[PDB]
Amino acid sequence: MVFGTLYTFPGDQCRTIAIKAVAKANGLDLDIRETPRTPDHLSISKLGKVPAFQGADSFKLFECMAIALYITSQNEQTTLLGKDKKEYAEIIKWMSFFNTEIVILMTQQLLPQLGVIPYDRDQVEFFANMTQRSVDVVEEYLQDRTFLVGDQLSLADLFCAGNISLGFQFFYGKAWRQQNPNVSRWYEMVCHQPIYAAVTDKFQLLDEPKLTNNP
Amino acid sequence: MVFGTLYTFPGDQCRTIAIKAVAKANGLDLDIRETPRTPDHLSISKLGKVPAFQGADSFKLFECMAIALYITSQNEQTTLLGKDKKEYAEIIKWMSFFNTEIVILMTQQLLPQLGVIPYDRDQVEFFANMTQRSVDVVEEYLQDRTFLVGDQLSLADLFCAGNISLGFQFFYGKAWRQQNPNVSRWYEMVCHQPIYAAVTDKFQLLDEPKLTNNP
Ligand SMILES: CC[C@@H](C/C=C/C1=C(C)C(=O)[C@]2(O1)C(=O)N[C@@](OC)(C(=O)c1ccccc1)[C@@H]2O)SC[C@H](NC(=O)CC[C@H](N)C(=O)O)C(=O)NCC(=O)O
Ligand SMILES: CC[C@@H](C/C=C/C1=C(C)C(=O)[C@]2(O1)C(=O)N[C@@](OC)(C(=O)c1ccccc1)[C@@H]2O)SC[C@H](NC(=O)CC[C@H](N)C(=O)O)C(=O)NCC(=O)O
Ligand SMILES: [Co+2]
Ligand SMILES: [Co+2]
């Protein structure tokens, strides 16, 4: 049957992509609800947050790290969670760093520029630079690394790549990628991994950013 | 020997307490560096963030979820990570919810009121209410629950309780706890668990908040 239901947004969502990806790779069918905050969704996430999950099990879950790990752990033969205890902890590290130090800061750079949230050129400039100072850590770490953790694809590669896809959607044009070659290579590499390509729209990159910090 | 070194702040820190707690419970000695951002600390966390960890191993880690899980997983007999795959995912859920939807929002309520960060009565009021709307979820969930996950103490109880201790330090006086009985009971219960009491200053609660949203 269907393994469970996943509440999300239409298309590719930065906190959802890995969840779709490892579900397919683990052979778990999912019912994708692309309409958020129905009675069913609030039953899981009272604050109405995407992603939210409920199994056929009828087991309930928010948050994205928890859902991704849950679905992944289903296959006991998976190689997406590290060789050993250290690589696992490392997978946890990158997943938490990307989700709090990159997505949360990039969100406050972005929403004002879409008119969701009040706009202040200086607030937005702050977040843009705080977001990039966190991405700079990854650029640097990836100097002469292929994968975020260990020597093969992990959940961190999938989950993090899906996270940072927010920036490739709006801000990271050719210039930015010239300037940030390792993150760009690694991101473009994870996007072409079949597990990840299978559950996403066609790969596409900005030429110029869709956004600069104008209102 | 010492199992590793932990960079933190002096005294009880909301993202550090569980890490100390499960290290002791697992019989791992830790060298506690209470002076952040030395050359050694930046070697782990280039952004200078607490907690950061390095084993005698010389294995390196930030972020707090990753460190806590790493140290905990050391004992293969631990009961702090759930009976099964669901309870594990649940432990991951509460750890991520407390760390992003409570600590991050409570931080922006708090820092302006300490003068770390610019102050705007309305910005602070926003965060205060967004912080409480996330805590309300826990109040509600804990109605007729003892532990966050399963039927015994887990890492989520320890880690989350340490997180929310920020609020008990500054904002949550007798009034607040009258108003929010389940979170209060559960917090006060985790603080009296010996594993957690062992690595903290004496238990103490506000009468009146140390802070209201004045500058
Ligand atoms: C970037 C992709 C996300 C879109 C974000 C939307 C968003 C809105 C709208 C919004 O109000 C905000 O982000 C948010 O959710 N909280 C927010 O305002 C309080 C914020 O600044 C913040 C949150 C947490 C910590 C610090 C600041 C911000 O303005 S993905 C869709 C959203 N998902 C999540 O937020 C899940 C997060 C959780 N940690 C997890 O599963 O990992 C979402 O559902 N937003 C709708 C909403 O009303 O909250
Ligand atoms: C609440 C206990 C924390 C104290 C927070 C201090 C703090 C300062 C100072 C600061 O600038 C800020 O919080 C921060 O770190 N980033 C911040 O500004 C960009 C912010 O608003 C934010 C961060 C992330 C997502 C959204 C917003 C905010 O003003 S604990 C000590 C601090 N630890 C961490 O931040 C670790 C977080 C990581 N996810 C993890 O290990 O889990 C710390 O070291 N702060 C110092 C600093 O300069 O960053
Ligand atoms: Co650079
Ligand atoms: Co109430």
Quick one: closest CA in A to B88, which residue? A70
| Residue B170: both structure tokens together | 């500054």
A152 C-alpha to ligand 2 centroid (Å):
31
Residue A85: list chain B partners with CB under 8 A.
70, 73-74
Instruction: State the residue for tokens 């390792």.
Output: A182
| Residue B152: both structure tokens together | 């015994």
Quick one: closest CA in A to B97, which residue? A63
Measured distance CA(A180)–CA(A193) in Å, rounded: 21
| Residue B167: both structure tokens together | 């609020």
Measured distance CA(B133)–CA(B7) in Å, rounded: 31
3-state class of B201 per DSSP? coil
Measured distance CA(A52)–CA(B155) in Å, rounded: 22
Measured distance CA(A30)–CA(A7) in Å, rounded: 10
Q: Which residues does B136 contact at the CB level (< 8 Å), separation at least 6?
A: none
3-class DSSP string for A19-33: HHHHHHHCCCCEEEE
Measured distance CA(B40)–CA(B29) in Å, rounded: 19
Residue A86 and residue B67: Cβ atoms within 8 Å?
A: no
**Technique behind this structure?**
X-ray
Q: Is the CB of A17 under 6 A from ligand 1?
A: no
- Which residue puts its alpha carbon closest to atom 4 of ligand 1? A107
3-state class of B131 per DSSP? helix
- Domains of chain B, CATH where assigned: 1-76 (3.40.30.10), 77-215 (1.20.1050.10)
Judge whether B174 and B206 are in contact, CB under 8 Å.
yes
Quick count: other Cβ atoms within 10 Å of Cβ B126?
14
Q: Which residues does A53 contact at the CB level (< 8 Å), separation at least 6?
A: A4, A5, A6, A7, A19, A44, A60, A61, A62, A67, A70, A71
A39 C-alpha to ligand 4 centroid (Å):
21
Burial of A207 (0-12, 13-18, 19+ CB in 10 A): exposed
B90: preceding bond cis by omega (within 30 degrees): no
Residue positions of B in the annotated binding site for substrate? 49, 108
A209 C-alpha to ligand 3 centroid (Å):
17
